[PDB]
Amino acid sequence: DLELHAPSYPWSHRGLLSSLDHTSIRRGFQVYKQVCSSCHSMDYVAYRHLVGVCYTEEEAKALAEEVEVQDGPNEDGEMFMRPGKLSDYFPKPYPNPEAARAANNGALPPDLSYIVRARHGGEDYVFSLLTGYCEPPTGVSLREGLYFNPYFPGQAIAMAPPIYNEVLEFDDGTPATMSQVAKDVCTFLRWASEPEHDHRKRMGLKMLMMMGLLLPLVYAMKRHKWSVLKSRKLAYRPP
């Protein structure tokens, strides 16, 4: 059996009040679009959420119209195909779950809208997983089609190696090293799971400050109004 747990990587957003590197989010979206979107899906995230996080409005619009998304029945009686816009969720790669299972070896690529909030370990898992591919150890013979990943439960993941060195060209020009690609995609997936990650932390900061201020004064109020009982100095004078 055994379950090799993912080591705790020192992510930039790991800090108590540290938010994700949004430039890393911009880089991590491209790998999802050009690599992970080929078989996987992010159905719960639309192009609208992308603006203001790692893209501006015009780039988001252009990116959305790059793909083609289905709209409702036209005035003739059938589906009419239209380019995407801001209010369209990320395109599904496969028409239905059955098509997804059949197209692959027989497994199902889980949607990544929550894969970081569903896997025990979080980003440290996924990153390590994408970088955990290796030759199976002696005495283990995986079936044709199965690939060996120690971090995957059962060590028999049905995933072709998704990330290899120089898989795609980052627009800004950062090197396409597999480690960089995996790091950026993991940050992007964490953002996808927890979009409020920035604001939450920001809110927490304020909660730390004012409750560091309210708590003494309120306490200072209590000891103020409770001091009468705390300095009673009783006396007994029986006859």
């Binding site: 001091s227 009468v228 007994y236």
Partner: protein, 74 residues
Amino acid sequence: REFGHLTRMRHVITYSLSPFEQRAFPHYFTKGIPNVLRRTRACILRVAPPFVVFYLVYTWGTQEFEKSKRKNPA
């Protein structure tokens, strides 16, 4: 149950001072720290032992489990 039908008491004199002339934090640390140390001394020997034996039981279970999950000569 309201004030007046509570008890009978006699020859008990109670003084007091307004909250506006007594410091709300009178020698906070100077007398608080010995007080907290005394309170901790009173109860540590009767509070902690069950928790430490729980800690031992928990850690022991953790390894015993993962050893049971280890390999075996054959």
